[PDB]
Amino acid sequence: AVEPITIADLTEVKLDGKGALDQLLQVTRLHLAKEHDAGRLKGQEYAAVLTGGITAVLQNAVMFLLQKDEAANKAALVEAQIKLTEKQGELLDKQIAQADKDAELI
Amino acid sequence: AVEPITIADLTEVKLDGKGALDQLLQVTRLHLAKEHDAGRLKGQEYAAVLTGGITAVLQNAVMFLLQKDEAANKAALVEAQIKLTEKQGELLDKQIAQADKDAELI
Numbered sequence: 001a002v003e004p005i006t007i008a009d010l011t012e013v014k015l016d017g018k019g020a021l022d023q024l025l026q027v028t029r030l031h032l033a034k035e036h037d038a039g040r041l042k043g044q045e046y047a048a049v050l051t052g053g054i055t056a057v058l059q060n061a062v063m064f065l066l067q068k069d070e071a072a073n074k075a076a077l078v079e080a081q082i083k084l085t086e087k088q089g090e091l092l093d094k095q096i097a098q099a100d101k102d103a104e105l106i
Numbered sequence: 107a108v109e110p111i112t113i114a115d116l117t118e119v120k121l122d123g124k125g126a127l128d129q130l131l132q133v134t135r136l137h138l139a140k141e142h143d144a145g146r147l148k149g150q151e152y153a154a155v156l157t158g159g160i161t162a163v164l165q166n167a168v169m170f171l172l173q174k175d176e177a178a179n180k181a182a183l184v185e186a187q188i189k190l191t192e193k194q195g196e197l198l199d200k201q202i203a204q205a206d207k208d209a210e211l212i
Contacts (some may be wrong), residue, residue: 020113028160030121031131040153049157056161060168067172068111076107078179083187092193096200106208 010065021062028053116171126167175181 011019016026032049035041117125122132137157141147 018113023113023117023119024164026119027117027127030119031160034121035153035156038149039190040149045153045157049160053161057164060161060164062149064116064168064172066192071172071176072108075176078176078183079107082179082183082186085183085190089186089190089193092190092197096193096197099197099200099204103204103207106211 005065005069010061020065023060024061025050025055028057111171111175114166126171130163130167131156134163175207 009019011017011021015022028050032041032046036046037041115125117123117127121128134156138147138152142149142152
């Protein structure tokens with residue numbers, strides 16, 4: 001169950017790839033494109049914003065990939081522990097009555 | 107019970123998608139649109155604010171997705187432990203009386 005996360009997983013070199021960096025850049029491009037299509041951006045702020053954003057987007061994507069997968073696993077582990085505590089509580093509920101019946105042997 | 111959070115979960119590439127980034131951008135757009143509809147914004151501050159916000163919104167969404175799911179699981183685990191401590195307290199309440207009755211065997 002060990003899928004090795006690789007540079008290909010982060011980003012393949014193609015512009016239209018499926019890497020996380022690639023798709024974040026694509027969505028940024030779409031938002032800027034709609035903004036320019038409406039009368040609100042010239043063709044130069046479009047480049048300025050993207051170039052400014054590149055490194056921050058990279059850092060965020062790197063942060064995302066490392067912590068992404070294991071969080072769901074942690075949550076499932078927690079809910080399994082929830083059920084386990086349910087059962088321990090039930091056993092102790094049995095325990096009190098068992099001891100109370102055991103009282104008079106002494 | 108392991109749903110793998112993916113890039114699609116974070117954001118699909120479409121503008122009108124259901125990704126967290128997409129919906130945060132949509133709500134920001136709605137607030138700015140109402141502000142412009144009232145006589146309070148020109149069509150250029152609208153672009154300036156959005157472009158400035160992009161990366162901060164991205165960072166906040168990434169922070170949100172990782173910690174979102176497991177918090178509820180942690181809370182449920184805590185309340186299960188609450189019930190467990192209830193039962194342990196009851197058992198010890200049985201314990202004191204048991205020992206007091208056991209006193210004279212020595």
